[PDB]
Amino acid sequence: DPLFSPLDPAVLADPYPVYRRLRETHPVYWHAGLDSWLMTRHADCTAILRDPGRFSTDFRKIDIPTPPTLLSLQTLDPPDQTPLRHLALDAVRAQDLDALRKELTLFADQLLDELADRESFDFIHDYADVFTLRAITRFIGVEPPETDEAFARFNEPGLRARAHFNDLVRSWLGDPGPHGVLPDVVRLLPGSGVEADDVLVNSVRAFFHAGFEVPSRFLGNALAALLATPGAWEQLVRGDVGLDTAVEELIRYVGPVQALARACLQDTELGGMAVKEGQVVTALIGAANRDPDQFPDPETLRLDRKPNNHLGFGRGAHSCLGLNVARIEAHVTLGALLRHPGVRSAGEPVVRPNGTLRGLSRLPLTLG
Ligand code: HEM
């Protein structure tokens, strides 16, 4: 593609200048390669996410079938999605976030204390993955299987891995632990209007992944951005900016979710362009969060930025249910790293070849 090649190596290295030019010339752009419109402005992406009747997550409505193991909260829209959405909302909000912050603070400190002895380690493998996997298993209230403690099978073999995970989920539902999102789901299911069928099981799988790979990649993106921005780490070290506001700026700046796809169900004009029923639109929210029309000086990392109405947690009917867990994870991680002021890069990052959910596979670091 002449404008946007998401898996081009030079593009993966830094997509944001490519997003900017695309936004500047064709903010609503038809991409033949991806068979989708590409919206790079905050206003357009917000509209895409706030009208399920016009832009749907259920691609069956444009006659694309859903693999049965993928029909879930994520791939349904109201009214189909609604009982599940509310059940998940209810089980999440029943959790004690103060207790979660307390135990994650201890875990982050002991992780980095052990990694302080190294002179160079991969922040991704040794902290981001370990920390987020601990958080999501404790939050859901399940134990890692001894034969696959890293859940490595679950990152046809894909069909077999989904069926194995579904087997695990059903055993959890049948014998829930003493706390967490899943035991509260079990408690709340009678009278929720949700059936304990395959859609529920698939939804637990989707919840796990939403609460694992996504925050893990954010934590790596965020630290990489701080290390690569002159003065940004030292600003945190000095207490010059608050962590809450810094975390929201880091989500805006390098939040992992790059693309949210929707199916167009009614003709619509956007940026002058006539999007047609049956076509796919892609809200490039990574680009939208650097849209100058919404954020002044958007390509500059401003840890004190206020206001900051970023799209990093989505909008509307499918907005992120774990966003306050994500914020606790980031806040805890930064405070824990800040106990080791000499943190510095220790080699080059390498980017995962992923244009949809952006992250690093390696982030060489030392704590000093
Ligand atoms: C920095 C971390 C995170 C970011 C940036 C993030 C971002 C997002 C975004 C953009 C969406 C919208 C998806 C869409 O519109 O199709 C979403 C949905 C969702 N997120 Fe998060 N998320 C994060 C962490 C988490 C965590 C930790 C959990 C669970 C503990 C979680 C649970 C969910 C769920 C269940 C949904 C689906 C909601 C639905 O489809 O109705 N997320 N997330």
Indicate if ligand 1 lies below 6 Å from the C-beta of 313. yes
Structure-derived torsion over alpha carbons of residues 110, 114, 117, 120, reported in degrees to the nearest 10: -100
Report the distance separating Cα 127 and Cα 129, nearest Å: 6
Indicate if ligand 1 lies below 6 Å from the C-beta of 207. yes
Return the ligand 1 atom nearest residue 92 CA.
30
Q: Are strands 344-345 and 268-270 parallel, antiparallel or unpaired?
A: unpaired
Return the ligand 1 atom nearest residue 206 CA.
35
- How many CA atoms lie less than 13 Å away from 368 in the CB half-sphere? 9
Q: Which residues contact 364 (CB under 8 A, 6 or more apart)?
A: 120, 121, 122, 123, 345, 346, 347, 348, 349
Return the ligand 1 atom nearest residue 215 CA.
2
CA 118, distance to chain mean position in Å, is: 29
Residue 112 Cα to ligand 1 midpoint, Å, equals 26
Residue 231 Cα to ligand 1 midpoint, Å, equals 30
Encoding tokens for residue 265? 């169900």
Indicate if ligand 1 lies below 6 Å from the C-beta of 100. no
Report the distance separating Cα 296 and Cα 290, nearest Å: 9
Domain extents in the chain: 9-366
Q: Which of 280, 320, 333 to mutate to test the pocket of ligand 1 (most atoms within 8 A of CB)?
A: 320
Which residues is 351 bridged to in the sheet? 360
Q: Which of 323, 329, 334, 358 to mutate to test the pocket of ligand 1 (most atoms within 8 A of CB)?
A: 323
Return the ligand 1 atom nearest residue 88 CA.
35
Residue 209 Cα to ligand 1 midpoint, Å, equals 9
CA 44, distance to chain mean position in Å, is: 20
Q: Are the C-beta atoms of residues 113 and 206 closer than 8 Å to each other? A: no
Please say whether the structural domain 9-366 has been given the CATH code 3.40.50.2000.
no
Instruction: Please state the length of the chain.
Output: 368
Q: Are the C-beta atoms of residues 343 and 337 closer than 8 Å to each other? A: yes
Query: Which residue numbers come right before each break in the chain (C to N over 2.5 Å)?
Result: 155
Nearest CA to ligand 1 atom 41: 318
Return the ligand 1 atom nearest residue 255 CA.
5
Work out the number of other CB atoms within 10 angstroms of the CB of residue 115: 19
Nearest CA to ligand 1 atom 21: 320
Q: For this experimental structure, what is the resolution in angstroms?
A: 1.9
Report the distance separating Cα 246 and Cα 168, nearest Å: 38
Dihedral-angle region of residue 278 (phi above 0 means left; psi in -120 to 50 means alpha; beta otherwise): left
Q: Are strands 280-283 and 36-39 parallel, antiparallel or unpaired?
A: parallel
Which residues is 30 bridged to in the sheet? 37
Which residues is 31 bridged to in the sheet? 36
Encoding tokens for residue 271? 């940026």
Residue 363 Cα to ligand 1 midpoint, Å, equals 23
Q: Which residues contact 149 (CB under 8 A, 6 or more apart)?
A: none
3-state SS of the chain is CCCCCCCCHHHHHCCHHHHHHHHHHCCEEEECCCCEEEECCHHHHHHHHCCCCCEECCHHHHCCCCCHHHCCHHHCCCCCCHHHHHHHHHHHHCCCHHHHHHHHHHHHHHHHHHHCCCCCEEHHHHHHHHHHHHHHHHHHCCCCCHHHCCCHHHCCHHHHHHHHHHHHHHHHHHCCCCCCHHHHHHHHCCCCCCCCCHHHHHHHHHHHHHCCHHHHHHHHHHHHHHHHCCCHHHHHHCCCCCHHHHHHHHHHHHCCECCEEEEECCCEEECCEEECCCCEEEECHHHHCCCCCCCCCCCCCCCCCCCCCCCCCCCHHHCCCCHHHHHHHHHHHHHHHHCCCCCEECCCCEECCCCCECCEEECEEECC
Indicate if ligand 1 lies below 6 Å from the C-beta of 83. no
Report the distance separating Cα 303 and Cα 163, nearest Å: 43
